[PDB]
Structure formats: C-alpha cells, structure tokens
Amino acid sequence: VTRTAAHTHIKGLGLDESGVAKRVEGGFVGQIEAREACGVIVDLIKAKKMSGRAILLAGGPSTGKTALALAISQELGPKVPFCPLVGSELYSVEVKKTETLMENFRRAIGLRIKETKEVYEGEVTELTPEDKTISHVIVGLKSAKGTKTLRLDPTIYESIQREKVSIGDVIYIEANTGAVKRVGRSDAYATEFDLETEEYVPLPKGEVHKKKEIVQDVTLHDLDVANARPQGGQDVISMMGQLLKPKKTEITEKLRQEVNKVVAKYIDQGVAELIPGVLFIDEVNMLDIEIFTYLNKALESNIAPVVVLASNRGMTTVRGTEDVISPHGVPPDLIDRLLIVRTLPYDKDEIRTIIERRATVERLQVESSALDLLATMGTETSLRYALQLLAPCGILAQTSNRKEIVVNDVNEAKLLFLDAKRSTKILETSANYL
Amino acid sequence: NFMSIVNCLMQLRKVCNHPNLFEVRPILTSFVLEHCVASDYKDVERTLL
Amino acid sequence: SSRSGGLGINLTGADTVIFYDSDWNPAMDKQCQDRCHRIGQTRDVHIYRFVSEHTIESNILKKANQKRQLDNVVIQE
Amino acid sequence: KSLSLIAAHSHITGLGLDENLQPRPTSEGMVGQLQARRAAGVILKMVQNGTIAGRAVLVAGPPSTGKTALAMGVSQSLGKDVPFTAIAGSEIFSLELSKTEALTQAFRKSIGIKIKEETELIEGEVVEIQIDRSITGGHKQGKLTIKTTDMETIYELGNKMIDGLTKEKVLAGDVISIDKASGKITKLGRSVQCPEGELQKRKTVVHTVSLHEIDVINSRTQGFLALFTGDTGEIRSEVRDQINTKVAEWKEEGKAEIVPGVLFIDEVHMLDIECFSFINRALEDEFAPIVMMATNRGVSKTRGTNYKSPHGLPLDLLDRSIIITTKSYNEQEIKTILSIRAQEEEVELSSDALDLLTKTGVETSLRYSSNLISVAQQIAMKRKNNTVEVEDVKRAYLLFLDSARSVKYVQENESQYIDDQGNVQISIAK
Ligand SMILES: Nc1ncnc2c1ncn2[C@@H]1O[C@H](COP(=O)(O)OP(=O)(O)O)[C@@H](O)[C@H]1O
Ligand SMILES: Nc1ncnc2c1ncn2[C@@H]1O[C@H](COP(=O)(O)OP(=O)(O)O)[C@@H](O)[C@H]1O
Ligand code: BEF
Ligand SMILES: [Mg+2]
Ligand SMILES: [Mg+2]
Numbered sequence A: 001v002t003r004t005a006a007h008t009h010i011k012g013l014g015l016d017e018s019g020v021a022k023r024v025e026g027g028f029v030g031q032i033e034a035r036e037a038c039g040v041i042v043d044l045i046k047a048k049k050m051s052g053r054a055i056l057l058a059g060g061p062s063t064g065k066t067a068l069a070l071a072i073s074q075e076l077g078p079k080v081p082f083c084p085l086v087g088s089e090l091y092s093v094e095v096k097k098t099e100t101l102m103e104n105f106r107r108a109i110g111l112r113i114k115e116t117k118e119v120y121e122g123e124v125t126e127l128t129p130e131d132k133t134i135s136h137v138i139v140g141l142k143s144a145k146g147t148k149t150l151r152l153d154p155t156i157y158e159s160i161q162r163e164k165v166s167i168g169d170v171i172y173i174e175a176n177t178g179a180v181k182r183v184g185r186s187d188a189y190a191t192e193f194d195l196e197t198e199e200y201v202p203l204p205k206g207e208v209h210k211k212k213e214i215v216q217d218v219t220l221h222d223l224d225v226a227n228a229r230p231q232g233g234q235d236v237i238s239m240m241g242q243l244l245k246p247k248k249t250e251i252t253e254k255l256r257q258e259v260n261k262v263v264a265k266y267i268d269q270g271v272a273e274l275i276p277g278v279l280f281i282d283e284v285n286m287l288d289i290e291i292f293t294y295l296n297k298a299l300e301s302n303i304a305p306v307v308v309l310a311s312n313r314g315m316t317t318v319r320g321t322e323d324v325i326s327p328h329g330v331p332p333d334l335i336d337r338l339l340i341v342r343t344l345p346y347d348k349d350e351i352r353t354i355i356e357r358r359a360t361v362e363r364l365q366v367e368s369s370a371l372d373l374l375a376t377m378g379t380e381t382s383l384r385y386a387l388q389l390l391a392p393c394g395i396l397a398q399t400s401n402r403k404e405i406v407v408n409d410v411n412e413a414k415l416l417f418l419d420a421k422r423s424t425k426i427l428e429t430s431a432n433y434l
Numbered sequence B: 001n002f003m004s005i006v007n008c009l010m011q012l013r014k015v016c017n018h019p020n021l022f023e024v025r026p027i028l029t030s031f032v033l034e035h036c037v038a039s040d041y042k043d044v045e046r047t048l049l
Numbered sequence C: 001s002s003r004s005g006g007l008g009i010n011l012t013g014a015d016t017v018i019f020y021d022s023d024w025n026p027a028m029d030k031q032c033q034d035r036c037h038r039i040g041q042t043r044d045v046h047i048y049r050f051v052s053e054h055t056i057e058s059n060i061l062k063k064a065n066q067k068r069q070l071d072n073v074v075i076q077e
Numbered sequence D: 001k002s003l004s005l006i007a008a009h010s011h012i013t014g015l016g017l018d019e020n021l022q023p024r025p026t027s028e029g030m031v032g033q034l035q036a037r038r039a040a041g042v043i044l045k046m047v048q049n050g051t052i053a054g055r056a057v058l059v060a061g062p063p064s065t066g067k068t069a070l071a072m073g074v075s076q077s078l079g080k081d082v083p084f085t086a087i088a089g090s091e092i093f094s095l096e097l098s099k100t101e102a103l104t105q106a107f108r109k110s111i112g113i114k115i116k117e118e119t120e121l122i123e124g125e126v127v128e129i130q131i132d133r134s135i136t137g138g139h140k141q142g143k144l145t146i147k148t149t150d151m152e153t154i155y156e157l158g159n160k161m162i163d164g165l166t167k168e169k170v171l172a173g174d175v176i177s178i179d180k181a182s183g184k185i186t187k188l189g190r191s192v193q194c195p196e197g198e199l200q201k202r203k204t205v206v207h208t209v210s211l212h213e214i215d216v217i218n219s220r221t222q223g224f225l226a227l228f229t230g231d232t233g234e235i236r237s238e239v240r241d242q243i244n245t246k247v248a249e250w251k252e253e254g255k256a257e258i259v260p261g262v263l264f265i266d267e268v269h270m271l272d273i274e275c276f277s278f279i280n281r282a283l284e285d286e287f288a289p290i291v292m293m294a295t296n297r298g299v300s301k302t303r304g305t306n307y308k309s310p311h312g313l314p315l316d317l318l319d320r321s322i323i324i325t326t327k328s329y330n331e332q333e334i335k336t337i338l339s340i341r342a343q344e345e346e347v348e349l350s351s352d353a354l355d356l357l358t359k360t361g362v363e364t365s366l367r368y369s370s371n372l373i374s375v376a377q378q379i380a381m382k383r384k385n386n387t388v389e390v391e392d393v394k395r396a397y398l399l400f401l402d403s404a405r406s407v408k409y410v411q412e413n414e415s416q417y418i419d420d421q422g423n424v425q426i427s428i429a430k
Helices: A032-047 A065-076 A097-108 A154-162 A220-228 A236-244 A253-269 A289-298 A332-336 A348-361 A368-380 A383-399 A407-416 A420-428 B002-016 B037-048 C028-034 C056-066 D034-049 D067-078 D099-110 D159-167 D211-219 D223-229 D237-253 D273-282 D315-319 D331-344 D351-363 D366-381 D390-399 D403-411
Strands: A054-058 A082-086 A110-112 A115-129 A137-142 A147-152 A169-174 A180-185 A209-214 A217-219 A278-282 A306-311 A338-342 C016-019 C046-049 D056-060 D084-088 D112-134 D138-147 D152-157 D175-179 D185-187 D200-210 D256-259 D262-266 D290-295 D322-324
Touching: A032 A065, A032 A306, A032 A338, A032 D366, A032 D390, A054 A065, A065 A082, A065 A278, A065 A306, A082 A097, A097 A217, A097 A220, A097 A278, A097 A289, A115 A147, A137 A154, A147 A154, A154 A180, A217 A220, A220 A253, A253 B037, A289 A332, A289 D084, A332 A338, A332 D403, A338 D403, A348 A368, A348 A383, A368 A383, A368 A407, A383 A407, B002 C056, B037 D200, B037 D211, B037 D223, C016 C028, D034 D056, D034 D067, D034 D290, D034 D322, D056 D067, D067 D084, D067 D262, D067 D290, D084 D099, D099 D200, D099 D211, D099 D262, D099 D273, D112 D152, D112 D159, D112 D211, D138 D159, D152 D159, D159 D185, D200 D211, D211 D223, D211 D237, D237 D256, D273 D315, D331 D351, D331 D366, D351 D366, D351 D390, D366 D390
Parallel strands: A054 A306, A054 A338, A082 A278, A278 A306, C016 C046, D056 D290, D056 D322, D084 D262, D262 D290
Antiparallel strands: A110 A217, A115 A137, A115 A169, A115 A209, A137 A147, A169 A180, D112 D138, D112 D175, D112 D200, D112 D256, D138 D152, D175 D185
C-alpha cells in the first residue's frame, strides 16, 4: 500500500507566519535554530532576487541534514525547480567535470512559458502531387464538420507516406511541430472487411483546425540542449543527424550568452517568466579540489541560483591535497563565500518521539513498554539502529499473530541482530578475520 | 443569483463523474522555438566563405 | 438515464442497480432503482451509489444524512 | 536590456579613473586600491593602445580583496565591441581536449577582427502583388508596386524573389525589406510601420568576429555546428599558419582589421607546468593578447612538481611578467562597500545597525557582512518593517554561524564528526 524509506514523514518545515519554529510540527523535533534558518532560506528563495549565495548544513550522522533537504524540497513545491545531487556522481567519464557542474547549474534554472499549437485532424481524401510536379502533396482532411485541403512540405509528406496512411484513414496532424500520426480507419469501412487487424475509429468531431494555449514549464537547460542538438523527427535526415553524434558535448560560452539573451527577449515580451532553483549536493566533501576551485568562480556568476550543500566531517585533509587540512574538508577560499547552519544531535525524549512518529506513519503499533525499550537501546547504539529494527519487531509480532510489538519482540530482534558495535566486538576475537 | 449556482452545479456534475469539461488532454507537443541561433550566424559564415 | 426509462418500465432481468449521479434524489432514485424491483424478481436488489471525496457529492450525501435527506437547497463548503 | 541580478560584482560599472590616471576614491562603485586602480588605468592604456602585444601582467593579493572585482571593473571600463574573455583554470582541464590546444584556443578566441561590408537594401510599402506565370508550364513573371513616402514604383521581380514571396505569405499593405544579393525578405508590420526615404538605400553591414570562429569554419565543413556546440579539437597548426598569413595580408590591404582582445585567467596557482611552459613560449607570439593573472594563493608547490615555487607559479613565468599586489581594507572601506551594497540591493539599514554590520564585517570578513545585509532584509520584513534594525543584525549573526565559530565548535566536538581516519562516536552514553 504505502512505501517509505527514512523519509516521507516530512510534510513541511513546520513554521508559523512569524517564522518561529514550533517544537513539534511537520513530524519535526528540535533543530529550532535549524528550522528557522531553513525558513530564512525559504523566504530568500521566495524573493527570487538573490543569486550566487551558498548555504551548507554542518552536521554529523543522523543530524537531519538530508532530512532538512527533503523538508525544503517539500515546501518548495512542484513549480520551484529543485535538483538533488550527489557530490560523488559529478565525476564524469565522457565529459569534463566542470561541464557537468555548469549543466546542473543550468538545470536548476527553470522558466514557465505559454504557447499555442495548431491541431488538424480528419480523414484524407487525396494524396496527389500538385500539377510538371514537385515533391509536394495536397491532402484533404474531412472531420465531422471540418472540410479542408492542405498542401504540405516534402519532409512532412515523407513522414506521412512512412506512416502508411491512405484514403479512409483518420489522422492527427499538427501544424507547428509537423508530427504525423494516423488515428485509424473510419467506422464507415468497418463493414467493408469482415475481419481486419486494423481497428476502426470514428471520424474526428468538430472542425479540422483547432487552437489551445499551453502553459508547459521548461528549464533553461532543456532549451539549451534543444538548440544544441536535434531531438526528434520522422524524416530520415533527422535520424541521420541524431546518429551522426550521440555523444554529449559541452556548451560554449556564446551558446549560454545567446540562450540567456533570447530568454531575456521572451520575458521582455511579457509571456516568459523566470524562477530560480535550489541545488542540493550530498557529501560535498567527497568531490575534489578541482571542483572547489571552479566553484570559486562559479559562485560569483550572475544567473547561478541558490545552492545548498552538506558535509559529515571536520578538520580533515582536502581531496587532492596533502598539507591542506580544512574543516569539513572544504578549503578556506570557498568557506569564505559559504554560510553555515548549525545542527544538533538528539537525546532520549526526541529520539523516542521520532521513532513513535515514524511508527505511526509505518502503520505499526508499539506498546508503551516496548516504546521505553526502543528509547533505551536507540541511544547507546544509535537512533538509526532502532529505526531499522522497527519493522522486524512488527513482523515478529505479526508472526506471533499479535498486533502489538511487545518487549519480547524487541528482545528477540536484538538477540538475532547485532549492531556495528557488536560486529566490531566479535571481530576483535577473530581466528581468521572473523 | 441562484442560476449561477445551478450552472456551477451542472459543470460540477459533468466534470466530477468524468473529465468531460471540454475534455482536452494535452498530446504533449514539443516546444517549436523558431530562434534558430544558427540562422543568426549562417550569414556571417557565408560572408566569410 | 433517469428520464429515459427509469419511470414506468417493468424490467426484471437484473438484480443490481447502480446510480452514477443523483443531484435531486428525494424521489427519482426510488423509482429508478425500483424499475428493476419487479414481481418477477427471485433475488435481492443491490443498490450501488457513486460518490467522490472532497466534492459536491460527498457534501450533499453527508448533509442529507445529517438532516435525514429531507430537501437540499444550498450546497457549499 | 541585459538580464542582470544582484551579484558580488554587479555593483561596479567601470573603474572610475581620471584623464591623468587618478582614481577617484568612490568612482563607479569602485573604491580604494589607488595603486591597483592606477595599474588598471595603465593596462587600459595598454589595451586601447593596440600597438603593443605579448604583455603579461600578474595581479596577486590576499583572499576576498577584490582582485576579481578589479578585473570585472576593468572589463566594464573596456565596454562593448572590445573582445574580452573571462575564464578560470579548471575549464581547460578536459579529456576530449588536451590542455595545450585548449590554451591555444583560449589565446585564439581573445583577439577579434572587424569586417566592414556594404549591402543594398530595398525597403518600402507594397501596393499590390501581381505574378504572371503559366498554369502548368511555369514561366513566372512576378510584378509588384512598391511605395514609400516619396516614390510609387512598380518592380518586375525575378524567379527567386517571387518564389520566396510564395514561400512567406504577404499581403498588399504589408511592408517588406529586400536585399539584392541575398534575396531574403523581412516583414515586420502592417498598416504598424511607416517607411520613409529612398527604396535603394545603400547602407553598410559591419560584422565583428574573433579569429577562432573563422579558424573553426575553415577547419571543417562541420565547424559551424562544432563551434555552435564546442565539440571541436586539435586543429592542425598549418590551418593556423595559413589563416594568420591571410589575416596579415587583409591587414595590409585593409579590408578587415584586428582588435587585440583581453584574456582573463583565474586560479593560475593550480595550473600545470606544461601549461606554464606553453604560456612562456606563446607569449612571444605577435598575436598574443593582453592577459592578466589572478593568483589568490601564495607560496605553494607548483602542480606536477615537488618544488614550492613562490606565488604558486614558476619563476620562468614571473620573469617575463610584471606583478602588482592588493592590500587590505580599512574600516572606512568596509563602510563604503556595505553602503554600496545597501543602495544596490535596496537595504534601509539603521545607522547603528550599519555600524554593527561594519564591525562584524571588519573582524570576520567582508563577504560575511555582504550576505548578512541580504538576510537582514527578510529578517526585518518577517515582522513587517521596511527598515532593518540592530536586533535583525544580531539575529542574523547568531543564526548563521561564522567560519571561525564553526572551527572552534568542531575543535571541542571532534568526536561528534569523523576524523582523518574516519572514526566518529555516535552513542550518547559511555
Ligand atoms: N526533526 C526531525 N524530526 C524527525 N526526524 C528527524 C529529524 N531530524 C532528523 N530526523 C531523522 O534522522 C535521520 C537522519 O537524517 P538525514 O539528514 O537523512 O541523515 P544525516 O542527518 O546523517 O545527514 C532521517 O532519516 C530523519 O528521518
Ligand atoms: N574596491 C572594491 N569595490 C567594490 N567591491 C569590492 C572592492 N574590493 C572588494 N570588493 C568585493 O569583495 C569581493 C571579493 O571577491 P573576489 O575578488 O572574488 O576575491 P579575491 O579578491 O580573493 O579574488 C568581490 O566580490 C567584490 O564585490
Ligand atoms: F408501471 Be409501474 F408504476 F412500475
Ligand atoms: Mg542527511
Ligand atoms: Mg576571489
């Protein structure tokens, strides 16, 4: 029925209209300063005027860093382009790393557009070259009340004749894109053959010409890849071009200049609009100093939207360096341009509260004494261990045909499962690397 | 006016049972952008040649 | 439809009645569902009513249950 | 109508020098660094001098001191029509393009060439369109009267023009622009446009371009889309030689003239020794642009070597280049720059709050206050007041911790996080 993995318990940050973080709201406990800072980011990005600022989360394991990322993503909404990312995947084997960085930065920028398409439909009565002739064909579409003839381009007619359409075939044809598609045969010819694989469909209703506005959203990266290389086509030259190069290539600076100029013209027209995005990169400490020194310039850009980072280390050596040991594995030059949100760990009461909340969303019922147990051993080992053991305890209750997780259930669960500490301890007494 | 309410009730009835309010499901047509930045430079390339 | 044949026909080949929509159903639903309810019926009649959630149908049905379904004049939420 | 947002360099528009290279203390958003701004004027006179080439200048200094701001202000001072290139040292490091030819292309893109071409344009409102032809034999003879404020002339149009006029739908009242050589048609408005003057207007069309574009075009027939997509690489040097000779003869006969561009390279301390030697040898090129170095790193080991060269660069590069540095900022410089931030991003910060932000910027860092002034906007408007007070600044300071504060916090919380070995304690008991 329901699916979850350490998350989906977040329905929002859980603030008020005044910006004060409620103690328990949106399935959140503690981190009041962190939640208020996240709301500061919320009304930073709602202003959509700021650009080029970096905010990272400083916290250890189980500190709710990526949980806070899920919270901010949830409160951002579908319209706001949020792009989660992992600091390890930025390493690319086919293209340079900085190209991937700029690619995801351009992905972060989204922009709503409005457009109207022209729709033609009906049954074609003639497929004949005009006449002393050239590769053009007149086509006459017959709808329920639409009756028009159309002369078409050689390429679109080539796509038409590759669609194997004929007289008595109702088709769906667009004017702007030019994509061809046959709906089928008219029901008037259903009786003509007693049996036929081809299915008969009614004549299109209404008039052949149609109009409608489209408010579809598109990121600037999608436009850049659209005008960088062709995307689709029903004519042979389209596949020729696509198969000429399937390799992804970098983007020139002048290409970015022209795409931002054209989108500036479109937004000046009064139709286009722009909305910044949020970039979340997991374990930014995992990437190399090369990306750091490229971001030293990338942060100083103009259209570069707000980026959120996270780390799980302290006074550690920077990747690609020997003597450059820095906090969070981030060199000082970038941290001068970085702002930090401090996080805090969780003690017994809030650990118990989060476990019982995620058990409620887990649709598992835990008795009070078993709640006390999971509060107990969820502290001297980790909260994550009790979080994992929640489901096996419920299933062990189910096997005993009981709907309540009891102290005995968690007892056998912890007896037949060992944590990292127990694994290390039993590794201490090893005959042959046990 | 209650006739506005009756009208709204009719659209509610005709949209709730089935998406029959003008029943326009987008065919997901692509953007047909006509800038063609290559056209802004084909003239320059021709002059160079 | 409600006004097509759900008035006086004597159909007796079925045992189930399904109502897709009934905006004004203090009376019409009764005869519509009992059209199949005929003497030549050897089995019980199952009546299925279609309602949605957070819509006009749910509000109308719940308020009719609240007031024992006397008469609906104003529908709002 | 450029699309610009608030940025760390969007405030400055021009250096703000004098005729005698005298920098005004507060000019065009650029403040302080009198010697640096005088050197900026010197490199200006270099770049619009045009008679010198192959000059390398080094700009160094402490972090966050605005050397990048100095370069951005210099670029703004150059203005339009001057080819300027700004890039960091990480973009060159690529696998499809080796470092050496990438740097060659970086040099090549810098210098631009002006091309002046005369065009024949026919622009006037149409009266009617009448095309003679055959029903099945062709024999197209198109005619259409063209009118303006001072002529009413009938024109017999050739096959190409009327084929185009059949391609694009036009009506009698529509106005179109006709060029004789190309034969293309451009219509913009309907009786919207009020054409005037002579039909046979003889106006030139001037096109600027770097020699990189012509090099890529001549390298390959696919070079058009190659430069439009960047998937070029390893152009034969004989093409470079022939194109250099061709532009040389063009210069002597004067049909086209070159514009020596400006190259900006950042983070040269992370540059490789092979690239250093390539720069050392390519500086002697006659077509060598004026390039400045932006090294934010001091004494460090040059990449590819185990030797800790000063300024992170080998002395061979430093010998054939001049070096200037930048200094710190006294508290009044911080005051001025934060005032420029407040006016640029529209912050009505309180005077006492302004002083508190000035102090916090002075002791900690400039960019910390530069972001605090931005966050103070929403910290104030959340209580619905346009002005920003001292309590908002203190709230921003306590909410968003500082780098030194985080360093201290982790120094007594080493066990909270992982170490160099990676060990970390998660249990709260024993
Ligand atoms: N305020 C909170 N309320 C509920 N659950 C929380 C809270 N903070 C952290 N958690 C839980 O702690 C776990 C650790 O969060 P996450 O950021 O994903 O890992 P880490 O903190 O190690 O980066 C998450 O699965 C989340 O469910
Ligand atoms: N004289 C100045 N006028 C205006 N802004 C300045 C000045 N000096 C420094 N700044 C600001 O300080 C910031 C320093 O950033 P940057 O130049 O990238 O660091 P670095 O100086 O280490 O290269 C710039 O973004 C710039 O806006
Ligand atoms: F004919 Be009835 F009233 F069923
Ligand atoms: Mg996390
Ligand atoms: Mg800098």
